[PDB]
């Protein structure tokens, strides 16, 4: 799972930005959101999102879905570490469980249930 954010910036740059933003907004988690490769979905212009920690993963799904102008009826899947997260988790829990050493949570989205298909 490649992220343009990581290709664009070294680890030290990312971690400095991750710790800064985690201190500036403690009630929020920083999330990189990019389209998965070979995905048949609209692209997201912006990839850096600050998401409230008590937001459910499902509500976060809805927010990204509206940013790419899809309806609830459109096939849309989200991936963290190549697995689809549980809907009822909070974004804080997902962040605490999956954030990388640069303090970011990385999410990819696709129209297929398997990342990269």
């Amino acid at each position: 799972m490649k992220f343009q954010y990581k290709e664009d910036h070294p680890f030290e740059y990312r971690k400095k930005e991750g710790e800064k933003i985690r201190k500036k907004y403690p009630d929020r988690v920083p999330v990189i959101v990019e389209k998965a490769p070979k995905a048949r979905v609209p692209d997201l212009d912006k990839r850096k999102y600050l998401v409230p920690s008590d937001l459910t993963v499902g509500q976060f799904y809805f927010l990204i879905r509206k940013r790419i102008h899809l309806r609830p009826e459109d096939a849309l899947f989200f991936f963290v570490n190549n697995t689809i997260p549980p809907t009822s988790a909070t974004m804080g829990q997902l962040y605490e469980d999956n954030h990388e050493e640069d303090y970011f949570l990385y999410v990819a989205y696709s129209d297929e249930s398997v990342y990269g298909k």
């Binding site: 933003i21 920083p30 912006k46 409230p52 937001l55 976060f60 927010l63």
Partner: peptide, 6 residues
Amino acid sequence: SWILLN
């Protein structure tokens, strides 16, 4: 710059 969701 960052986008603040909800």
